[PDB]
Amino acid sequence: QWNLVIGFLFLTWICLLQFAYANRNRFLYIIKLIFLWLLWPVTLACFVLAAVYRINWITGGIAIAMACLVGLMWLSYFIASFRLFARTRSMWSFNPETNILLNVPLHGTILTRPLLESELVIGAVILRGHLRIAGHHLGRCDIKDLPKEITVATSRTLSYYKLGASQRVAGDSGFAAYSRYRIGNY
Amino acid sequence: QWNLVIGFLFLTWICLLQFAYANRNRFLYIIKLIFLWLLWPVTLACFVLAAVYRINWITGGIAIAMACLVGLMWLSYFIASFRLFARTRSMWSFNPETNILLNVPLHGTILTRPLLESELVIGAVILRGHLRIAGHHLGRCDIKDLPKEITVATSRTLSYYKLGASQRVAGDSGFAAYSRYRIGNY
Amino acid sequence: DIVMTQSPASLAVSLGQRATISCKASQSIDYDGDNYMNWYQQKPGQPPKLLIYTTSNLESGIPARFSGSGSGTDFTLNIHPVEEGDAATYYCQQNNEDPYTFGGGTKLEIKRADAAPTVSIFPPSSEQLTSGGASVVCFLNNFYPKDINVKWKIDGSERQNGVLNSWTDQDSKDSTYSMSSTLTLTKDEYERHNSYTCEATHKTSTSPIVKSFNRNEC
Amino acid sequence: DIVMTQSPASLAVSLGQRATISCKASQSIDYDGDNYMNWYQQKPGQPPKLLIYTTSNLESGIPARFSGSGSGTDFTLNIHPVEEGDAATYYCQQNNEDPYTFGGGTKLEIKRADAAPTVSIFPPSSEQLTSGGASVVCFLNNFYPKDINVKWKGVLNSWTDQDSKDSTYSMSSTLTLTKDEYERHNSYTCEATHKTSTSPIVKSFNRNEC
Amino acid sequence: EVQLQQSGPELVKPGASMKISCKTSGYSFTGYTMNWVKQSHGKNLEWIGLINPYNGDTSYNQKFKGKATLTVDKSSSTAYMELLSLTSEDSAVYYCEVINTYWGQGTLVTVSAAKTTPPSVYPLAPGNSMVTLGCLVKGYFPEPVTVTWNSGSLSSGVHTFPAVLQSDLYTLSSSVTVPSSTWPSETVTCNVAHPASSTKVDKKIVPR
Amino acid sequence: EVQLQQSGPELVKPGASMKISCKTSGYSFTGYTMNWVKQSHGKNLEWIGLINPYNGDTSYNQKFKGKATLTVDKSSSTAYMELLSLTSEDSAVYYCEVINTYWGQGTLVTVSAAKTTPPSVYPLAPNSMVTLGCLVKGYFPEPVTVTWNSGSLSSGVHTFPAVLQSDLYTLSSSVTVTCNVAHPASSTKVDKKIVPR
Ligand SMILES: C[C@H]1Cn2ncc(C(=O)Nc3cccc(C#N)c3)c2C(=O)N1c1ccc(C(F)(F)c2ccccc2)cc1
Ligand SMILES: C[C@H]1Cn2ncc(C(=O)Nc3cccc(C#N)c3)c2C(=O)N1c1ccc(C(F)(F)c2ccccc2)cc1
């Protein structure tokens, strides 16, 4: 039967699962988030198209349950993201990865990035004058760091983080940590 | 045409690309590494059987150049792993992600983990008595941890890391950093 | 509605000894698995100073003689090597809910050896002669403990009407006190008296210290 | 072949003044985009003590008076508020390549106001007299500078290292000879010439002083 | 070096309103939270609210709502808490803070329907190698009055006693101690600086 | 809390072999790399090599290849650097260290051919201060420890470096009383007392 194009899709599985780590270039991260977002409705439409064209009755076996589940699990996450956007109008709340945001007050501007999980201690490494707090490339900085950053969820829980202690390594590199000190419920 | 099974394949692009990273669960990480390793043999055989069955001449236009590429790359990425195993015999060098290892001398034994990149400064957080150095869950430890660790490449490189300074947070949490101090070429 | 009650109202500790303050929570200030609690020190004439910001984690630049501890609803602050430079008031805050409630406060007093009050008396200045009222002032400097009585004697007997008193706060170097006593009276009453005396009786030294002067001491 | 040359042979600084040591590499100790350099201190009768372990970031427990710097092939160690307890020898090491080479050494002496020795004499003892020899001893304590002259009116001299509490030098002189030659003289004299005075300080004894 | 500078002591008639300033320096104005605290009737503290300079987002407590209003001016980096419908129980000291570590100087607010009376300064003369002399400030309103001694004459050994409210008037006294070898050999002067009346008296002590 | 204790001074004949111990304590013996360093002829330092206590993995510098062989004994947590075919050029002090911060104490090695003669201890005896002396003469090999009143009078002891003269070291001490002399590699412990004259 058909073996070429179906095999070629397996090569994409090595493009993924190996390059999903991409957090160095911001453009790559944005393109990956966009790909993960626009792929959510595409996979639903194909399931419904397979379900409507009744063949061998398998379209009503698992092909109607699959589409229904992938729709009911999409609606809830979209409304949760809408709630997070309503709390903080940051436009990052519609990412398909997580519903926790991190705000970092750099020089004159505030940078918002998605956060996988909110914890008590957050690290910061400034290798060769290139700040990277939570694995996120935040730009170019030095040891002049901001002594207060913020983590925003949607169900209350505005967490304020304070600069613990910063050390300098090898001239221009460094390390620092932020520890939580205040919680404010919406 | 065929819509059900191929659409069901698009669901795997959300299970992967979203859950594929250096997650805390070591069993899941080993499972992901095993899946990544088992992937490569398939594409060779699949392309072999897609090119031998000459149909519409497409089996020679692209089914042999891509197969040759994916066959010649596997040999290099296998011989490099065998060289790294020759340097250090730890069985972790065969992972298809990276050829850099991190050795951490915990209580009694030594723990080896893959390392994406060797850097000058390495952080560590001990949230709620759960050590995690480079994003890898190393088990349960305290603030009284090891003052020397190593990073092993294969290109005649062994880097020694020395404990810079450790701080305690909220009773049983804390953070620490390691800075490189010696390089030894094999 | 999480009113916090620290109930040492005042506390006396000698040099070197250890002092503890026992601010306690109301119900459940332990959210997210950790207890948030701030400890403040405030000296007269200055804004509060942060010492410890989550039950622990003494602030940068603060000497390690301060230690915070506790859990559940009971929290404590400890100063083990009590020096002479800390005679402030200490507060506790929760940092957990919408009303960030403070504690009542606990004034830390330093115990020391006794001393005798240096006594001085002053006559009414010639500038206020035209004003029509006279004010005689008595100063008692560098004494301990705080409690001390002062009597204003006129024409032999005593006077207890129109006398005002003021104490300073405990010193930051000698841990001793000062006091000012003012007797203010209309000049008509000043005409009909000749001898004025300020006597200071301390807890010790049963014989009071007397300083007196006449009207004709010009 | 990465021989490393710190060539201030010796230093003499006063209290509070800046102290500088200028170890320099050979060609290319700059691997991985950064320079690795350890600075060591060694006092007499003790193993070396690490101060700075990568061109910077001094080791924990070390006073901040020591600072390391440099790049390329030029590296420097600075001690700004020179105390009286820093009279050791300082070394530089690379920590970069297959052999890890050390420096040469730089003995740091601290300058102090002048002083005069306290000369003392010691005659031979009967225990050595019965054996068949004699050895007269002269002791000089707490003088400065080290360069002083001692004369006897077959000698061996020994110098103490600079003290770590008051920064002075002591000295011992011994004159050993057969007892028969010891019986040929009656008066012995130990004289010391120092730059602090214009005339020698003389301590003499005689065989009748017993 | 984060620094916060407040407006200064003010007297407000009952029923009026007041605006307090917390001008900041040493950091980018947007990024912190600028809590406001009130210390009243001695040594008990209360929390008023907070506000995010980047974009609004004020937050009060259920006790000071409708009484305090916080604004922000990003151009000049100032905060503008304002009180409304002031009464007798609204006199306190108001602080502004950022990360609970950097505080303002404080702002005494006096809410009373009374006149502003300038102080009257009188000297004291003594009419062992240690002699004390001072000056008495009487009949002034309202707090505060800053008293010093010749701006450098024996900065140590000075004792200023807290004022006592005596029939809608204040009385304070300051004393200094000098060796017997400097008086009357040198000149010692005490000066008061009442801000609420915009005056600076300067009277020296003569012997008698 | 990391501590390393070496073996002690030894005198060996030329052409023989030698073994040195670096017993460690205060940490988990496996994990640190255990460098070895040699300081000779005064104040110049060298490098011998390193060994991984986990699984062999020794690395020397070519100058000392075939001269030293690093060994490890896991059971007692000891390191066993050993020298072969010794020569008079091998008299030095050998240190063992881990992370360039924790060093040993030093092992003085004397390579020659002479008997370990015992020292001869003599007293010395003769104002605002009084100075009293003690002399040690004619011993071999180094070192020897001189103490006053068993650790007392530690406020003015001035010991002097031993000077070689016809293969017999000599030193002196002064205090400003008992002179206790301890010679390790001769089983000699001589004590003397000073008397007024
Ligand atoms: C785990 C959870 C974490 N998580 N937090 C927040 C969100 C979220 O906001 N998702 C989202 C999705 C799409 C559009 C938007 C917007 N705007 C937002 C998510 C999320 O997507 N999660 C999630 C769930 C399931 C899966 C699955 F791949 F495993 C899967 C797929 C289909 C059927 C069953 C299982 C993979 C990931
Ligand atoms: C980039 C590089 C980093 N990298 N470091 C080390 C290794 C490695 O040891 N790989 C390996 C692979 C398999 C078996 C073994 C063993 N034993 C070892 C690797 C590696 O695999 N890399 C790598 C290359 C290509 C891809 C691709 F997915 F993009 C891809 C796939 C097929 C055709 C073309 C492109 C994804 C990743």
Residue numbers in the entry:
A (entry chain A), B (entry chain B): 19 to 204
C (entry chain E): 1 to 218
D (entry chain C): 1 to 153, 162 to 218
E (entry chain F): 1 to 127, 133 to 213
F (entry chain D): 1 to 126, 133 to 182, 193 to 213
Share the article's original sentences:
We strategically used FabB and FabE fragments as fiducial markers in cryo-EM analysis; FabB and FabE lock the M protein in the short and long conformation, respectively. By contrast, the map of SARS-CoV-2 M in a complex with JNJ-9676 and FabB (3.06 Å resolution) showed a clearly defined compound density for JNJ-9676. However, in the JNJ-9676–M–FabB complex, the M protein dimer adopts a C1 symmetry, with protomer A (chain A) showing superior density compared with protomer B (chain B). Protomer A was therefore selected to elucidate the binding mode of JNJ-9676. All mutations reside near the dimer interface of the M protein, indicating a putative binding pocket for the compound, or an effect on the conformational equilibrium between the long and short forms of the M protein dimer.
M protein forms a homodimer that can adopt two distinct conformational states: an elongated long form (86 Å (height) × 50 Å (width)) and a short form (72 Å (height) × 57 Å (width)). Here we describe the identification of JNJ-9676, a small-molecule inhibitor targeting the coronavirus M protein.
